[PDB]
Design a protein around this ligand. Structure first.
Ligand SMILES: C=CC[C@@H]1/C=C(\C)C[C@H](C)C[C@H](OC)[C@H]2O[C@@](O)(C(=O)C(=O)N3CCCC[C@H]3C(=O)O[C@H](/C(C)=C/[C@@H]3CC[C@@H](O)[C@H](OC)C3)[C@H](C)[C@@H](O)CC1=O)[C@H](C)C[C@@H]2OC
Length: 120
């Protein structure tokens, strides 16, 4: 498969994003060697009432393929470890600014915090 998902914390098994919904996520991205290339989890004395999760419309190409596909399988509250093959991430180009090399399998911890039913 082009990604794998391991559930770290079960969601509500009830509310799954549909294409066109807006999802709200916390994440940490790592390379296979363990290098953290990004996180939106704030470590400054900021937390609640300062930092906001990442919001995007799901299933329409706004994120790398691995995320767009995996999110549709997650329920609200779920925290999962996604291992995304390069073709469903940054492929041959990589991403120079984030120091992601060509052909990089990416690991993301993703927590789906909320869903707005924008598919309506
Ligand atoms: C208003 C400003 C623009 C706006 C940018 C921001 C808000 C800042 C944003 C949080 C983080 C950065 O995004 C620029 C940053 O995120 C990474 O650190 C990262 O962890 C990552 O991979 N993420 C973020 C978390 C969701 C999955 C994935 C993604 O898919 O992110 C999306 C993404 C980059 C999609 C492209 C779209 C075009 C395709 O061609 C390409 O396909 C190859 C994939 C993000 C969320 C976009 O929807 C939102 C934006 O564009 C990259 C390693 C390097 C990149 O910095 C350079």
């Amino acid at each position: 498969p082009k990604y794998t998902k391991s559930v770290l914390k079960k969601g509500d098994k009830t509310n799954f994003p549909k294409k066109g919904d807006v999802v709200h996520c916390w994440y940490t991205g790592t390379l296979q060697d363990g290098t953290v290339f990004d996180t939106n989890i704030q470590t400054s004395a900021k937390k609640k009432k300062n930092a906001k999760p990442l919001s995007f419309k799901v299933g329409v190409g706004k994120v790398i393929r691995g995320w767009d596909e995996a999110l549709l399988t997650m329920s609200k509250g779920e925290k999962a470890r996604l291992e995304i093959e390069p073709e469903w991430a940054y492929g041959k180009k990589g991403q120079p600014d984030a120091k992601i090399p060509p052909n990089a399998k990416l690991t993301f911890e993703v927590e789906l915090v909320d869903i707005d039913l924008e598919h309506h």
